[PDB]
């Protein structure tokens, strides 16, 4: 878990066409609807009783946007992600209690949004860069557990 | 279990597949290998360059597989009966890739349906490749 | 798929645990929290202090439903269906964790059943272990 | 890998005591048998049809030592295992083709043989550090696959 500038660049350069906000209330969005026990965390939120409910909830578009803005920024510090979210991870660990296998289930429910949103440009190979980046964030998201 | 909610849902994005079928199966297998590289372990004598004629029939070969499964979704385990016998004794692929080939399908699957891919839908879908993948992992031990 | 032989093997080994069971259920997990700290994410309200009273009933509770699956090897969905409805529905334990804990259990019998714990017995036991996080996974749609 | 002072210490002390072509033919003896599918790498090999055909197989008996004296010499470059296990990683994957969950499979295996070779001696933070330890061990021969 080191990325390559070839790749490393697919991430951060195709990222570019990304509108954060609708990318997050959906990724954020398909998690809670595809891995139902991530619900775990938000009965705080309202009706998460249906895809529809789910997915329509502002409280959820609300947090996802917030969850992928913080994202954006870390594609900004790729060389340094552990680097970037430590603070950001103690926090989910120490405080938030999140069962960090939720980082990989979102990286991937989000490889999937990106799937759906970009179509033919989401090539195998940007797909894949896309793939170590979600995995390492996943993993820098994770380094402060104990 | 997959619910009948689940069923139609599957039968249905699968219908738009129909016949590109073979091709979602190779682009499949093709992000397979560039993203999860390790899977590659399984095909030491397969030509896996972009385009391999091998990968290609692999995929009509992987796909035809799932059409079978789908057309059979209730009879799922006698369905794939025989293939079941097949990766468990013949190739004895670790189990962990299953979960790996399932996801990237999803994603071509994914990325091929602009419209077709409700998360309503998308969940139905992760969901049938895991039984689909459980069947198959069934005679391992 | 529990075989028959699988089956009297789980039964003579659970057999011998006779009574340390909720003693083995607390070492189980004492283990779980120090070899894989993630799992503790799920136990934020416990005193998970070594010898903590907290984990000592859990454990106990925690080996009872196992001794009861040991006893219904033949009907476990049922057996544990009640249990199956809590895990999936209130708890929302990441099924990923099922494997750690079964990791850990194997692993306490190892050091308490110097030779009941045959190689043919760990085999037997991993799969019991196995069979057991499925059913508890199942509720999980 | 990232061991500790009283970790490595504990570490270092459980193995003076590991009996190496012993625990050895033992684990790999058990992997073969717990999860019968790693069997795929070894038919040059003879009867694995059985656990006993299996614990008595010599070819296995053999190959196994190989693997732990491989292993006992790395408990020495604890400090940089990515370093000491590079040619080997370089070969599981180029020649060999073994699927890296495997190395993850036998580490768990080697903690149950200790478990069972040692008794209350193997407590939970010594368990915990050898865990930390076969963790880096497989992390380490997978390092380079490609
Ligand atoms: C990229 C993967 C993730 C990233 C980058 C991320 C990032 C963030 C950031 C920047 C915050 C703001 C917290 C703060 O400073 O106040 C946050 C909060 C939060 N996130 Fe994480 N998160 C991720 C995954 C998840 C997952 C998987 C869950 C549960 C599935 C989760 C649940 C939360 C919760 C519950 C909060 C606090 C909100 C409150 O009081 O409303 N996050 N996340
Ligand atoms: C959705 C899960 C999977 C399904 C439905 C599937 C389906 C199939 C089907 C029909 C066949 C051909 C058998 C025959 O010749 O009659 C096949 C062969 C094969 N599969 Fe699976 N497969 C899956 C996952 C995997 C995975 C994850 C691997 C290893 C990562 C794998 C490795 C193979 C190999 C090596 C062959 C034989 C290749 C060659 O023979 O020349 N499959 N699969
Ligand atoms: C074989 C696997 C497991 C079995 C048989 C089992 C069994 C049980 C039983 C019988 C109860 C308590 C409630 C009741 O019936 O009155 C329980 C509670 C619980 N278990 Fe599971 N469990 C297993 C695996 C896990 C895992 C992997 C986790 C992860 C964190 C877990 C977490 C919890 C929590 C949080 C509770 C409630 C403790 C409390 O609620 O105070 N269990 N378990
Ligand atoms: C961390 C776990 C493992 C270690 C440390 C390990 C270590 C070794 C070493 C040091 C060799 C010597 C190779 C040479 O350089 O000739 C070797 C050979 C080999 N391993 Fe790896 N091994 C591990 C797991 C496995 C596994 C799981 C398999 C298949 C399950 C495997 C299949 C083979 C084969 C075929 C050989 C060469 C043996 C012969 O040709 O007769 N190894 N292993």
From Swiss-Prot, chains A, D:
The listed outcome for residue 87 to I is: In Quebec-Chori
Question: Outcome of altering residue 52 to H?
Answer: In Summer Hill
**Stored CDD domains:** Hb-beta-like
Known consequence of changing residue 140 to T?
Answer: In St Jacques; O(2) affinity up
Outcome recorded upon mutating residue 60 to A: In Collingwood; unstable
Its function? Answer: Involved in oxygen transport from the lung to the various peripheral tissues.
Q: What is this protein called?
A: Hemoglobin subunit beta
Organism of origin is: Homo sapiens
UniProtKB/Swiss-Prot annotation, chains B, C:
Give the GO molecular function terms. heme binding; iron ion binding; oxygen binding; oxygen carrier activity
Would the keyword Iron be found if you checked this record's keyword annotation? yes
Q: Which residues form the signal peptide?
A: none
Q: What is the effect of changing residue 6 to A?
A: In Sawara; O(2) affinity up
Effect upon mutating residue 31 to S: In Prato; unstable
Q: Outcome of residue 85 to V?
A: In Inkster; O(2) affinity up
So what does mutating residue 113 to H actually do? In Twin Peaks
Read off the CDD domains from this record.
Hb-alpha-like
User: In the UniProt annotation, what is the result of changing residue 139 to E?
Assistant: In Hanamaki; O(2) affinity up
Outcome after substituting residue 126 to V: In Fukutomi; O(2) affinity up
- Effect the entry attributes to changing residue 61 to T: In J-Anatolia
Instruction: Cite the position(s) of the site with description Not glycated.
Output: 11, 56, 60, 90, 99
Q: What is the effect of changing residue 115 to D?
A: In J-Tongariki
SUPFAM superfamilies recorded: Globin-like (SSF46458)
Q: What is the effect of changing residue 47 to G?
A: In Kokura; also in Umi/Michigan; unstable
UniProt PTM comment: The initiator Met is not cleaved in variant Thionville and is acetylated.
Could you say what the effect of mutating residue 64 to Y is?
A: In Persepolis
Q: What is the effect of changing residue 110 to D?
A: In Petah Tikva; unstable; causes alpha-thalassemia
> In the UniProt record, which is one GO cellular component term?
extracellular region
**Mutating residue 86 to R leads to what result?**
In Moabit; unstable
Indicate where the modification Phosphotyrosine is found in the sequence: 24
What disease does the Swiss-Prot or TrEMBL record associate with this chain?
Heinz body anemias: Form of non-spherocytic hemolytic anemia of Dacie type 1. After splenectomy, which has little benefit, basophilic inclusions called Heinz bodies are demonstrable in the erythrocytes. Before splenectomy, diffuse or punctate basophilia may be evident. Most of these cases are probably instances of hemoglobinopathy. The hemoglobin demonstrates heat lability. Heinz bodies are observed also with the Ivemark syndrome (asplenia with cardiovascular anomalies) and with glutathione peroxidase deficiency.
Entry-linked PANTHER family: HEMOGLOBIN FAMILY MEMBER, HEMOGLOBIN SUBUNIT ALPHA
Q: What is this protein called?
A: Hemoglobin subunit alpha
- Organism encoding this protein: Homo sapiens
Organism lineage reads as:
Eukaryota, Metazoa, Chordata, Craniata, Vertebrata
């Amino acid at each position: 878990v080191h990325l390559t500038p070839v790749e490393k660049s697919a991430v951060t350069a195709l990222w570019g066409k990304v509108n954060v906000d609708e990318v997050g209330g959906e990724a954020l969005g398909r998690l809670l609807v595809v891995y139902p026990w991530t619900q775990r965390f938000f009965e705080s939120f309202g009706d998460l009783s249906t895809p529809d409910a789910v997915m329509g909830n502002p409280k959820v578009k609300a947090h996802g946007k917030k969850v992928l803005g913080a994202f954006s920024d870390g594609l900004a510090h790729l060389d340094n992600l552990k680097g970037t979210f430590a603070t950001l991870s103690e926090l989910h660990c120490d405080k938030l209690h999140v069962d960090p296998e939720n980082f990989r289930l979102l990286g991937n429910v989000l490889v999937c949004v990106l799937a759906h949103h970009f179509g033919k440009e989401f090539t195998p190979p940007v797909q894949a860069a896309y793939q170590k980046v979600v995995a390492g964030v996943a993993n820098a998201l994770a380094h402060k557990y104990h | 279990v997959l619910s009948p909610a689940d069923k139609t849902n599957v039968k249905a994005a699968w219908g738009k597949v129909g016949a590109h079928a073979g091709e979602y199966g190779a682009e499949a297998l093709e992000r397979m290998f560039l993203s999860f590289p390790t899977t590659k372990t399984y095909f030491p004598h397969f030509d896996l360059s972009h385009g391999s004629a091998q990968v290609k029939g692999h995929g009509k070969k992987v796909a035809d597989a799932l059409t079978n499964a789908v057309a059979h979704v209730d009879d799922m385990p006698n369905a794939l009966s025989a293939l079941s016998d097949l990766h468990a004794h013949k190739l004895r692929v670790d189990p962990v890739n299953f979960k790996l080939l399932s996801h990237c399908l999803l994603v071509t699957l994914a990325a091929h349906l602009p419209a077709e891919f409700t998360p309503a839908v998308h969940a139905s879908l992760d969901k049938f490749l895991a039984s689909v993948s459980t069947v198959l992992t069934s005679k391992y031990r």
